[PDB]
Every structure is written in C-alpha cells, then in structure tokens.
Design a binder for this molecule. Structure first.
Ligand SMILES: Cc1cc2nc3c(=O)[nH]c(=O)nc-3n(C[C@H](O)[C@H](O)[C@H](O)COP(=O)(O)OP(=O)(O)OC[C@H]3O[C@@H](n4cnc5c(N)ncnc54)[C@H](O)[C@@H]3O)c2cc1C
Ligand SMILES: Cc1cc2nc3c(=O)[nH]c(=O)nc-3n(C[C@H](O)[C@H](O)[C@H](O)COP(=O)(O)OP(=O)(O)OC[C@H]3O[C@@H](n4cnc5c(N)ncnc54)[C@H](O)[C@@H]3O)c2cc1C
Ligand SMILES: Oc1cccnc1O
Ligand SMILES: Oc1cccnc1O
Lengths: 340, 340
C-alpha cells in the first residue's frame, strides 16, 4: 500500500498525518511519502497569520461549516497542553468592524463569547459603526508546519523535494494512492477553471502591545481586501490585500502603502511600530473546496486520487476537518480494495 | 507659592502633573518640586503590572468608585493616541475565575463588554467553576512613570533625590503646601495605624503567546493571594502573593514556587516560559485611601498638607481620579489664601 501525498503546506501535512495515525495499525506495508516542490519556510501556509475565522457568508457546500467546526473543537481541546507553544496555538480575542448592521455569522456558536460591539467600543473606531467581538484561536502557519513535520518524521513518513509533472508519472513509479494537496497550483496537474489565486500581501510588524485582532470589512472592496491586524506570537500581522488572478509572487510597493495606511488609520499607535518582514502568497480560491476521489485511468489498473485543495482564505481554519474527510475517503478505498 | 510633592510613584507624579496643568496659569510664582527617596525604576509602582481593576467588593468610601471610573474614562480616551506606547497603555481582555457564583462587580459597566463565562470557556480551567470575561486596560507602571517624568520635566518641575525626615523639615525650608504621596511608608512622617504593607511578589516571564489576563479568586486565601497572569507589553506578570504586615523587600524562594506552581496549574503552556525577572513591592493597604487636607501647625503660620496615600492593590487603577481630587483640594487652599 504505497501512498504519495503531493503538497507540504498545511493541507498535505495534516492529511498525511491524519491518514497515518488512522491506518498504520490496519495496514501492514503502509508507506507514506510526501512529495513537495516547496517546504515549510516557503509555502503559502507560511504567509498566513493563522487566525481561525471562516468567511462571513454560508459555504456553498454546508459540509465546510462542519469541517471548520471540527477544526476549532480539536484545536481548542489542545490549547492547554504542554505542546501548544510548539504548534504555535493560542487564544486571541478581537473585533470585526463594519459600516452598517449585518447578520450574525453561521459560526457564531463555534467561537467563544461571540457578541455585538457596545457603543463604547465602537467609539474607538471613527470609520466604523458596527461590529462584533469574540475570542477565537491562532494557529501560526510556520510553527504548525514544523510541528506536523517532526510528527510525520517520527512516524516514518519520508519527504522528498520534487515537482511532480503529472499524476501518471507518480502512479507509473508505483503509488497505489495519490493525495493531491497542491493548493493554488492544482491546475498544473489537472485543469480546473474554478481554481484561481487570491494574491495576498502581508507585513510583519513589532507591536507587542497589540493584544486583539481587528478585522475590517468593506463590501465595496471585497473580503480580505480591507485592513486587518492580527497579533501573532512574536510579531503582528498587518494586511488587507486580496487580488483575484494575480500570480505575481513579489512584494508590491502599492500594496505595502495600502497595508500601512489602512492599518495606521485603524490603529494609530502602529506608526511607531518596527517593520520586520513582508511576504506574498496565493490563497487558492474556488467556489468550494475540492475534496473528493477520482480513479485515474493509467496503465493496467487505475490508481486512486484524493483531491484536497482550494481552501482560499481559510485553510488553517478548516484544515483538520478536511484531513479527517480525506482519511475517511482513504478508508473507503481500502474496503473496496478488500484490505480492511 | 512653593509646592512640595513627597513621593515619585504613580501617586506623587500624577498629582504633581495634575496640579501643574490645572494651576500654572492662575499662579505666577508657582514652583513645584518633587522630593523622593526612590525613583522610577525602584518604586512599588514599577513592580505593578498595571491592570485596571478595582476590588470586587464595594469601597468603604464610594467616592473611590468614581475615582476609578474617572481614571478609566481618561485612559480609554487616550488608548488610541500615538503616545500610548510611550505611556505603556493598551487594551486587554481576560478572565476572572471563581469556584462559586458571586455577584457582578460595581464596575461592570465601566469595563468594556463585561459578561459571564460560557461553559465552553470554563472547560479550559478545571479548578474553576464560574467567572467573568471583559476588556480592560493596562497602564504599565515603569513606562507610565517614565512618561510622567518627561512631562513634568518639560514643565520645569524639579526632582530631588532625598529622604524627608518630617513635614516640619520641609515647611522650615520654605514650602507653603506639601503633597503627601509617600505610599506604604507614610506612617514614618505621621503615625497611621490603619496603613499597612500588603507585600506582593511577582515573576516576569517570556510568554508572548499569552494575550489575556487571567485572575483567580479564592475567599479561603483572599484577594491577590490567588494565582494571576497578566501579559504586559514585553513580558508577562506571574503573581498571587499578598501578605499583610510583611516588610521584607526581598524575593522569597517559597513565594517564587507558589507563583510558579499556581500559574502553571492555571496555564500549563507556561512550563516552557523563560523567567526574566522577579520583584517584590508593598501594597499600601488601608481601609480607605487617605486623600484629605490637614493644616500642620508649624512655626509662625501653619503649612497646608494634602495627604494622598493608601491606594493598596489599586493605585494605577485609581490614580487619575485621586490626582484630580488632590488638585481640587489645592484649589480650595488657594481661595482661602485669597490667591485665585
Ligand atoms: C495572506 C494570507 C493570510 C491568511 N490568513 C489565514 C488565516 O489568517 N486563517 C486561515 O485559516 N487561513 C488563512 N489563509 C489561507 C491559507 O494561507 C491557505 O488557505 C492555506 O495555506 C492553503 O494551503 P495548502 O496546503 O492548500 O497550500 P500551500 O500551503 O501553498 O501548499 C501547497 C504545497 O503543494 C506543493 N505543490 C504544488 N504543486 C506541486 C507539484 N506539482 N509538485 C510538487 N509539489 C507541489 C507546494 O510546493 C506546496 O508544498 C491566509 C492566506 C493568505 C494568503
Ligand atoms: C506585586 C504588586 C502588584 C501590583 N499590581 C497592581 C496592578 O496590576 N494594578 C494596579 O492598579 N495596582 C497594582 N499594585 C498596586 C500599585 O502598585 C500601588 O497601588 C501603587 O504603586 C502605589 O503607588 P504610590 O505612588 O502610592 O507609592 P510608591 O509607588 O511606592 O511611591 C512612593 C514614593 O514615595 C517615596 N517616599 C516614601 N517616603 C518618603 C520619604 N520619607 N521621603 C522621600 N520619599 C519618600 C518613595 O521613594 C517613592 O518614591 C500592585 C502592587 C504590588 C505590590
Ligand atoms: O488575508 C486573510 C486574513 C485572514 C484570513 N484569511 C486570509 O486570507
Ligand atoms: O497584585 C495585583 C494584581 C492586580 C492588581 N493589583 C494588585 O495588587
């Protein structure tokens, strides 16, 4: 039973882990290998602040609401363990701000102590007249990736640095199952007109007095395109850039100024902050996550492919539920192959 | 009009400033001097984390409730000014934890978004079965003292390092008004059996993933004797030591282990925190603050004394209200001296 996971971002590594921990005791030769073009300092997952918050509107696929929920419940049950720091997991509260009244989010009961902003609170934000406060979680991409990595290593999973040119190439070389977690780059292996980059650019700043996240929302400009501030473990993330179809993996002066003007307007104390770093990445945007099986007809017998990609701006928020679901699909392959 | 402020902790410095800004334009020869034995790194004020939160039970003197509200309102009006960091002022949310239901506090409408804990939140704290969540402010002593100092200097207020042996000594050398801001040490200038040290000890820790304050309450061990965790700007404060009558300005191994065990039980992730510093200070405990006038019968004509001391575990919380009220008493001296 030879398994190749393509992708070493959050989706790949979590999925790889979830499959191993669930089926290594019911499969004798269960070889799991991770093939990736880039690893854990240099993926999109690394660029993310790691805040748990799904989109405000209900998911096209209501399944996604569950996957996010399961991810929250799971992370929360580990927020008070000696590991948390190593994962980069911790609790944070903060504000979602809007110009006008809007309906509560579907997830309002997943988070802790979700409530509307009282007028006292809104006065700290001239530009805003409505919003929420709640306590969520941060799972810092970098850390989380390192942790998954050493968890995978100690479980025997081998890692290889390579670009896969096609599914067949990997099946040809002997994989029985292929787990496709190639993110925004999925379409280079199998055309997907629905999958597209939402370019994001962030600034890492030194503002340790910042203890709340602050997300602003403008329907006029679109989701993820309004300034946000998200404190991390060691630094504070400044953002508010979302540009569909842009493939330029390079920091942009204009976007820098936009991050900075928006965030300073939002929180004046930020002016005396020190700029540490800046980064760009590509949310793998898609009307819904592709997470399903496909029998790839190649040679004598077809090899099995589990797709797990298109997590847009919520990959950390949802990764774990998706990983449990990929593992499920994996178990169904086994029983059909009469190996369970 | 020669004015002497005795004391350079938060009470001295804020009262000095408050008096200058309110009366420098209505008195020509208004000279203000601060006499203190210890300054801004070496005061009890500096040992304090800076959380704004009055005692749970109502004050002996209900005036104190306003003085706190006033301090809060004022600090909150500057939370977003571009000075804030220099002040060491910032917003923070957090938990008050209890073993049993208790009535809401009187200040519940001063803080932001005050509410009770939901069951989900309580599960993060086995040992506790009830509590609060709300958003407050932190005014870090060290920074705030540094800030007042530069404000006072540019106002031409002179500081002198010296231990004052008596009120007479000071009046003898020319002061018309004396502002008594000598904290826990006040009894040495005028016996006060009501005033006593509530010794405290705290650990400063490197735990920057900690974004919430956590205060625990136990009636069996009593106020400030229960473990607490309070994130600052650069470090986190570990505490929960209150000992009436203890005059030992020296870090105690036992207390160290108590802080540590209590806080680790409370937040297991603190196990891998790095210990940076440790400090001891003396809460100026007294059944109520002494903030009032006294005409001290010295030499030919008596000199006026404003007492401002005995702020216990809540000096930073209340200091501003206290200063405005000390200035008011000052205004009354002037009109009696027929000089307004
Ligand atoms: C700026 C920003 C902020 C974000 N903030 C949040 C947040 O705050 N909270 C949240 O939940 N989500 C957030 N996200 C979303 C999150 O960043 C992404 O959803 C998530 O990282 C998607 O990860 P992935 O594993 O799908 O892909 P990636 O992390 O990009 O990993 C894809 C992997 O596949 C590999 N690969 C691709 N093609 C091949 C190939 N042909 N051969 C070999 N290897 C290949 C790549 O090398 C890489 O290893 C944010 C996103 C951005 C851009
Ligand atoms: C461990 C600990 C933690 C605390 N945490 C908090 C908190 O989180 N939030 C909060 O609101 N409060 C807290 N407090 C309470 C706060 O620290 C005190 O209320 C406050 O510092 C008292 O300030 P003060 O200016 O009266 O006295 P001090 O800060 O001690 O200043 C007194 C000054 O008077 C001088 N002085 C005294 N006698 C003489 C003399 N004869 N001649 C000359 N100078 C003299 C001293 O040198 C000193 O300069 C804490 C206290 C402790 C001990
Ligand atoms: O830019 C983002 C901010 C928060 C969550 N997801 C994103 O993509
Ligand atoms: O130790 C303390 C913590 C918070 C407030 N006051 C104190 O004294």
């Amino acid at each position: 039973m030879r398994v190749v996971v393509i992708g070493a971002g959050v989706i790949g590594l979590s999925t790889a882990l979830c499959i191993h921990e669930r089926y290594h005791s019911v499969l004798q030769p269960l070889d799991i290998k991770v093939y990736a073009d880039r690893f854990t300092p240099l993926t999109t997952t690394d660029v993310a602040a790691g805040l748990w918050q799904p989109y405000l509107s209900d998911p096209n696929n209501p399944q996604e609401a569950d996957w996010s929920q399961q991810t929250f419940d799971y992370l929360l049950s580990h927020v008070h363990s000696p590991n948390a720091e190593n994962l980069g997991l911790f609790l944070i509260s903060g504000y979602n701000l809007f110009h006008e009244a809007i309906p509560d989010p579907s997830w309002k009961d997943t988070v802790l102590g979700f409530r509307k902003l009282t007028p006292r609170e809104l006065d700290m934000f001239p530009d805003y007249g409505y919003g929420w406060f709640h306590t969520s979680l941060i799972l810092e991409g970098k850390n989380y990736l390192q942790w998954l990595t050493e968890r995978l290593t100690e479980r025997g999973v081998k890692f290889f640095q390579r670009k896969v040119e096609s599914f067949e190439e990997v099946a040809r070389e002997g994989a029985d199952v292929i787990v496709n977690c190639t993110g925004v780059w999925a379409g280079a292996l199998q055309r997907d007109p629905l999958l597209q980059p939402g370019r994001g650019q962030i600034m890492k700043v030194d503002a340790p007095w910042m203890k709340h996240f602050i997300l602003t929302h403008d329907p006029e400009r679109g989701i993820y395109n309004s300034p946000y501030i998200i404190p991390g473990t060691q630094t504070v993330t400044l953002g508010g850039i979302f540009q569909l179809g842009n493939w330029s993996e390079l920091n942009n002066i204009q976007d820098h100024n936009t991050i900075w003007e928006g965030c300073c307007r939002l929180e004046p104390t930020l002016k005396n902050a020190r700029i540490i770093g800046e980064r760009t990445g590509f949310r793998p945007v898609r009307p819904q996550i592709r997470l399903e099986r496909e029998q790839l007809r190649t040679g004598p017998s077809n090899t099995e492919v589990i797709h797990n990609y298109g997590h847009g701006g919520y990959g950390l928020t949802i990764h774990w539920g998706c990983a449990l679901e990929a593992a499920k699909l994996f178990g169904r392959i086994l029983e059909e192959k009469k190996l369970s």
